[PDB]
Amino acid sequence: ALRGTVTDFSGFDGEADAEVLEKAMEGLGTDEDSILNLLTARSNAQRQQIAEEFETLFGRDLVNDMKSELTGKFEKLIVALMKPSRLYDAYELKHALKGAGTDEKVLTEIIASRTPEELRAIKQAYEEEYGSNLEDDVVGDTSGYYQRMLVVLLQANRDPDTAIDDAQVELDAQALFQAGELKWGTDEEEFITILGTRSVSHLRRVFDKYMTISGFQIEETIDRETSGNLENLLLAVVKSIRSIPAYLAETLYYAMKGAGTDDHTLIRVIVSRSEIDLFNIRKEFRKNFATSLYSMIKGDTSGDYKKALLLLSGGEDD
Ligand SMILES: [Ca+2]
Ligand SMILES: [Ca+2]
Numbered sequence: 001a002l003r004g005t006v007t008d009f010s011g012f013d014g015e016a017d018a019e020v021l022e023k024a025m026e027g028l029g030t031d032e033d034s035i036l037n038l039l040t041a042r043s044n045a046q047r048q049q050i051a052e053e054f055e056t057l058f059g060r061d062l063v064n065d066m067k068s069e070l071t072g073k074f075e076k077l078i079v080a081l082m083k084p085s086r087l088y089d090a091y092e093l094k095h096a097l098k099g100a101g102t103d104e105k106v107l108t109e110i111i112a113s114r115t116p117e118e119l120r121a122i123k124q125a126y127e128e129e130y131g132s133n134l135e136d137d138v139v140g141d142t143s144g145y146y147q148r149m150l151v152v153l154l155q156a157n158r159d160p161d162t163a164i165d166d167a168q169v170e171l172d173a174q175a176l177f178q179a180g181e182l183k184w185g186t187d188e189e190e191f192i193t194i195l196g197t198r199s200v201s202h203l204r205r206v207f208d209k210y211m212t213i214s215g216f217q218i219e220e221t222i223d224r225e226t227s228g229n230l231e232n233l234l235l236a237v238v239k240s241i242r243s244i245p246a247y248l249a250e251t252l253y254y255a256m257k258g259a260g261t262d263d264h265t266l267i268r269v270i271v272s273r274s275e276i277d278l279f280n281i282r283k284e285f286r287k288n289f290a291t292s293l294y295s296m297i298k299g300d301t302s303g304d305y306k307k308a309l310l311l312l313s314g315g316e317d318d
């Protein structure tokens with residue numbers, strides 16, 4: 001079911017590709033198009049091969065050459081596109097912790113929507129690159145239940161999908177109801193333990209049951225019961241439980257629907273997901289927002305920045 005929008009180019013020729021990129025830079029100006037048409041048509045693993053082959057042919061660093069020939073939001077995308085898949089999430093996480101004021105949005109998005117396999121892969125890569133323990137770093141930069149929930153999630157420990165138990169589903173649905181709507185204040189720990197540790201397949205069933213017994217969708221209750229930090233995280237986790245593609249589709253929409261563009265988010269989501277579920281993301285986006293992902297990117301962005309994004313994205317006809 002899970003489909004990306006960028007795949008390996010067949011008949012890929014690492015050296016030819018380098019020569020092309022060289023031809024697009026060496027001399028007066030810069031052939032943005034040629035760089036943009038090639039790199040959005042090669043997978044992450046293949047860009048790495050292009051970057052290594054470029055060095056052997058020209059004794060120059062591809063990425064740095066492009067940094068010195070490109071500009072603005074376009075350069076940012078290309079640079080993000082060039083970052084090894086393995087290191088990308090950890091890179092965005094590191095920059096989100098760096099400096100006194102943390103970037104919660106990024107922590108929540110990534111940690112709430114990455115599968116256990118992925119999260120433990122991120123943790124190892126992050127410790128390899130930076131010599132810091134990710135969990136420890138997150139603990140240092142967050143606080144309260146938001147910190148607690150993140151720590152729980154970072155254990156990469158969630159129950160595995162298993163035989164579905166009707167008794168457990170009713171029990172857990174009731175616990176959430178008793179912990180939220182029925183209680184003066186909120187049993188934050190119950191929400192956290194349940195929404196943090198229970199399996200995906202199990203929780204989807206618990207949601208349907210929660211609605212049946214409470215009249216509320218769990219998302220309404222989370223909004224009615226919590227605020228800021230914690231609300232966003234629990235909302236993020238819940239939506240990811242339902243559908244990571246649908247969660248990330250909503251993430252893109254909200255990055256574009258206002259007066260500006262949250263370009264930092266536009267870029268991260270498109271790039272990181274281009275080889276996993278961006279096709280799924282596009283389907284869900286259309287499904288929930290009346291237009292294609294394409295048309296909204298077209299409306300919010302300009303120039304080569306726009307051109308690359310659209311080629312990366314695809315689906316003009318969604
Ligand atoms: Ca040039
Ligand atoms: Ca030019």
Ligand SMILES: [Ca+2]
Pocket residue numbers: 066067068069070071072075
């Ligand atoms: Ca530049």
Ligand SMILES: [Ca+2]
Pocket residue numbers: 092095096264
């Ligand atoms: Ca960043």
Ligand SMILES: [Ca+2]
Pocket residue numbers: 096097098099100101102141
């Ligand atoms: Ca910080």
Ligand SMILES: [Ca+2]
Pocket residue numbers: 101102103104
């Ligand atoms: Ca902050």
Ligand SMILES: [Ca+2]
Pocket residue numbers: 179180181182183184185186225
């Ligand atoms: Ca309450």
Ligand SMILES: [Ca+2]
Pocket residue numbers: 185186225226
């Ligand atoms: Ca509360």
Ligand SMILES: [Ca+2]
Pocket residue numbers: 185186187188
């Ligand atoms: Ca409480």
Ligand SMILES: [Ca+2]
Pocket residue numbers: 222223224225226227228231
């Ligand atoms: Ca609220």
Ligand SMILES: [Ca+2]
Pocket residue numbers: 256257258259260261300
């Ligand atoms: Ca906008």
